[PDB]
Amino acid sequence: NEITIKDIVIYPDAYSIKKRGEDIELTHREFELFHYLSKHMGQVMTREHLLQTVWGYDYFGDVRTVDVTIRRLREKIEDDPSHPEYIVTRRGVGYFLQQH
């Protein structure tokens, strides 16, 4: 069931989100990553952890695929992706979902 963070509402059944009431097109993988983060609000996740968790344990592609997906998520959901208010980098560690 549905999870609210600031302007954004997550609909796990629908694999989609709305921000200020408006649909944002997310890929399955983008949604799964954002949804995973949102189940663990304010906890820093390493790229390696996010890779195996969201891409699956058999997935050994380059770990930068996590960074590429987070960038796409930021472009889609952030008012200003250079100052993210949802998905925040902890430098040299990982990413987390920054709740209010």
Tab-separated table of C-alpha atoms in Angstrom:
chain	number	residue	atom	x	y	z
A	1	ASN	CA	0.000	0.000	0.000
A	2	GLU	CA	0.794	3.708	-0.580
A	3	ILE	CA	3.732	5.700	0.795
A	4	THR	CA	4.009	9.463	1.011
A	5	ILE	CA	7.189	11.454	1.050
A	6	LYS	CA	6.831	15.291	0.816
A	7	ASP	CA	5.302	16.006	-2.611
A	8	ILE	CA	5.432	12.454	-3.803
A	9	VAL	CA	3.050	9.524	-3.420
A	10	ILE	CA	4.182	5.958	-4.256
A	11	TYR	CA	1.655	3.336	-5.510
A	12	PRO	CA	3.447	-0.072	-5.265
A	13	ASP	CA	0.503	-2.007	-6.835
A	14	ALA	CA	0.640	0.281	-9.917
A	15	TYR	CA	4.453	0.553	-10.020
A	16	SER	CA	4.084	4.325	-10.309
A	17	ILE	CA	4.287	7.647	-8.508
A	18	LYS	CA	2.584	11.032	-8.526
A	19	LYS	CA	4.242	14.295	-7.556
A	20	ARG	CA	1.906	17.118	-6.572
A	21	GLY	CA	-0.892	14.954	-8.006
A	22	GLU	CA	0.865	14.396	-11.396
A	23	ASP	CA	2.006	11.029	-12.857
A	24	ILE	CA	5.728	10.671	-13.452
A	25	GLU	CA	6.755	7.966	-15.974
A	26	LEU	CA	9.248	5.659	-14.230
A	27	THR	CA	10.739	2.442	-15.564
A	28	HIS	CA	10.120	-0.779	-13.570
A	29	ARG	CA	13.689	-0.613	-12.393
A	30	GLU	CA	13.532	3.081	-11.487
A	31	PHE	CA	10.334	2.473	-9.589
A	32	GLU	CA	11.788	-0.555	-7.772
A	33	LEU	CA	14.863	1.426	-6.746
A	34	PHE	CA	12.829	4.420	-5.550
A	35	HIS	CA	10.328	2.130	-3.774
A	36	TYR	CA	13.151	0.177	-2.038
A	37	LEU	CA	14.753	3.417	-0.748
A	38	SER	CA	11.319	4.564	0.428
A	39	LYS	CA	10.815	1.434	2.519
A	40	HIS	CA	14.023	2.370	4.299
A	41	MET	CA	13.688	6.094	4.638
A	42	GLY	CA	16.890	7.819	5.743
A	43	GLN	CA	19.097	4.687	5.592
A	44	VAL	CA	22.206	4.875	3.385
A	45	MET	CA	22.456	2.039	0.868
A	46	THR	CA	25.652	1.151	-0.988
A	47	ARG	CA	25.580	0.860	-4.807
A	48	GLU	CA	26.581	-2.855	-4.478
A	49	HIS	CA	23.627	-3.436	-2.128
A	50	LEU	CA	21.205	-1.614	-4.372
A	51	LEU	CA	22.488	-3.505	-7.417
A	52	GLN	CA	21.878	-6.988	-6.035
A	53	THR	CA	18.623	-5.994	-4.346
A	54	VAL	CA	16.927	-4.170	-7.256
A	55	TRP	CA	18.606	-5.861	-10.260
A	56	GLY	CA	18.646	-9.307	-8.599
A	57	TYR	CA	21.306	-11.512	-7.131
A	58	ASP	CA	22.267	-13.034	-10.504
A	59	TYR	CA	23.021	-9.544	-11.867
A	60	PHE	CA	26.742	-8.777	-12.127
A	61	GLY	CA	26.697	-5.864	-14.650
A	62	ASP	CA	28.725	-2.757	-13.896
A	63	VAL	CA	27.708	-1.129	-10.647
A	64	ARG	CA	27.448	2.257	-12.410
A	65	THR	CA	24.123	1.105	-13.661
A	66	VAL	CA	22.914	2.072	-10.112
A	67	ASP	CA	24.312	5.645	-10.610
A	68	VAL	CA	22.756	5.903	-14.107
A	69	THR	CA	19.333	4.894	-12.697
A	70	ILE	CA	19.554	7.268	-9.776
A	71	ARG	CA	20.437	10.089	-12.241
A	72	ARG	CA	17.351	9.250	-14.359
A	73	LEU	CA	15.229	9.163	-11.147
A	74	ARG	CA	16.592	12.578	-10.144
A	75	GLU	CA	15.876	14.039	-13.624
A	76	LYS	CA	12.321	12.698	-13.408
A	77	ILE	CA	11.380	13.560	-9.848
A	78	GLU	CA	13.461	16.422	-8.551
A	79	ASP	CA	12.506	20.028	-8.997
A	80	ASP	CA	16.270	20.688	-9.319
A	81	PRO	CA	18.389	17.535	-9.758
A	82	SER	CA	21.592	19.360	-8.805
A	83	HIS	CA	20.095	19.921	-5.301
A	84	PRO	CA	18.057	16.708	-4.746
A	85	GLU	CA	15.531	16.734	-1.942
A	86	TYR	CA	14.476	13.024	-2.262
A	87	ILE	CA	17.459	10.876	-3.308
A	88	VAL	CA	20.562	12.190	-1.643
A	89	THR	CA	24.223	11.140	-2.147
A	90	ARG	CA	26.348	10.327	0.968
A	91	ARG	CA	29.730	10.872	-0.677
A	92	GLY	CA	31.986	7.806	-0.851
A	93	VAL	CA	29.219	5.624	0.663
A	94	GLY	CA	25.868	5.472	-1.155
A	95	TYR	CA	22.380	6.918	-1.509
A	96	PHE	CA	19.399	7.400	0.694
A	97	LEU	CA	15.870	8.737	0.607
A	98	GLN	CA	15.712	11.918	2.572
A	99	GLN	CA	12.380	12.181	4.390
A	100	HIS	CA	10.893	15.299	6.109
